[PDB]
Amino acid sequence: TPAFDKPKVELHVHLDGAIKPETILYYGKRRGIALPADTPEELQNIIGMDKPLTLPDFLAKFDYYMPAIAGCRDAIKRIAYEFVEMKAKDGVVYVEVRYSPHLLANSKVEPIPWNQAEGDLTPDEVVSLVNQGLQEGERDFGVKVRSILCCMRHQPSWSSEVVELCKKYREQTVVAIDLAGDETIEGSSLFPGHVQAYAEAVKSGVHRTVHAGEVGSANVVKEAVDTLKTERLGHGYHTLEDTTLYNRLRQENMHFEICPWSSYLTGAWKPDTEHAVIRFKNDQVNYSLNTDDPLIFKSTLDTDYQMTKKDMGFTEEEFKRLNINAAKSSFLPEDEKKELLDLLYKAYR
Ligand SMILES: C[C@H](O)[C@H](CCc1cccc2nc(-c3ccc(Cl)cc3)oc12)n1cnc(C(N)=O)c1
Ligand SMILES: [Zn+2]
Known part of the structure; x- marks a missing residue:
């Protein structure tokens, strides 16, 4: 039954959007929040x-569960740990998971996310704890994992800490920076705090990816590339409304992080027209298949692969070409990237 019954690579999925329902019950219950239900x-x-x-x-x-997970020191480590386990079942051999350390913080973070009363969980140790849970997950379930940290469009004041956090925890899972949270706000790509953070990213060698084009015009996709210096684009479906941009990204080998199921459940893509991915498929574009938020979208990587092959006619060769491009575009050191590619080459025959 499963679509691509082979090893996979995922570069776009949010930790705070991949938590087991049961784990949220456990914590919501044990903390004093109560959710809109008590059964998994x-x-x-x-x-x-x-x-x-x-x-x-x-x-x-997010308003429902996040206040139950954010704040607790071991809730963050457990969610990371359980995350790696999840990918294992999906058959992923390499996965890059992102998140905003600030949105899990409850101390030294203004404003303080999701209401929530003050405390002592600083953004800095929130990521260190995720590192921990992520590394244990790697050794216990057998999946290679790296983490990307997210900046938020609306709160550019947190951006500097993000790059610093990326540089501080270099190697220890965090290999890149991201920009997320509503590309729709005017001139957000160009907010000084955001551009300075990405400028710092280049100056200290931390990789870059930006959410852009999911629901924003081609121009925001362009700002991400020309101003913030991205190496990958999250979604970036709208880059089609600008041909010299598209034509240019094609020859420059820009990588697109696609999440077809997600683009549906959020309205990004109307079922009326043909998904932006078939166009990419037909143009031999370097892109990947991604889950984004398995919790909110009640899905798994398979969910996305089923769809591409079911309602879009994706063949197993396209799935292989796809995942191999995913490995070339990963933010892995060159030595570990060769090792990764090699793995998939042998297993894809
Ligand atoms: C970066 C983090 O992991 C988040 C935080 C969720 C969040 C918190 C506060 C404000 C937020 N605004 C967004 C948001 C995301 C996309 C659009 Cl087009 C508009 C708003 O997401 C937010 N996350 C998780 N999944 C998504 C997602 N799928 O976009 C975002
Ligand atoms: Zn996303």
């Missing part, structure tokens, strides 16, 4: 979704 699947139906909704509808999902 019950909680999985209310904070998840089976049909496309609007932005605020989507955003509300």
